[PDB]
lysozyme (Enterobacteria phage T4), 162 residues
Amino acid sequence: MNIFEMLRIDEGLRLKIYKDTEGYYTIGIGHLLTKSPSLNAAKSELDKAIGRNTNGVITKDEAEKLFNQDVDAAVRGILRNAKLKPVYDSMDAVRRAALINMVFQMGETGVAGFTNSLRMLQQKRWDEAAVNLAKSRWYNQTPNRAKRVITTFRTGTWDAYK
Ligand SMILES: [Cl-]
Ligand SMILES: [Cl-]
């Protein structure tokens, strides 16, 4: 298992525009198109992202390519962030993957606000962090995915994914 496979599981793969759990226009592997309500705006954003006239549909390859860009961007978001980097720098490989997941789902800024959980992770207070991470909208809205990530922070293994 690795970050790719791990998110591929959390997000799924869809080749037609779709609405996410919050009702936003998305495509591929959890690639957010726009927060606008307009299906056109989404179509527009999509052809711009793909470089061609898509008409709301894309191929696997295309999907996969947005997916690489997206993971890359997430990582780099993390390294550029004064609140995240250290956390990330302190952890092992598996747990790092967990952090990136959060970041992919919710943005660097969203994640940078889990101050206290971040302090805990950094200190390696596993169980405590996992409790704290659960007192979040995030857990309450997407609880099964959130349990998966959480456990991953707790155990440093991929069990939740096997
Ligand atoms: Cl893009
Ligand atoms: Cl979920």
Observations:
- DSSP finds nine helices and three strands in the chain.
- The two ends are 9 Å apart (CA to CA).
- The pocket of chloride ion (ligand 1) is lined by residues 49 (CB under 6 Å).
- Residues 1-162 form a domain with the Lysozyme fold (CATH 1.10.530.40).
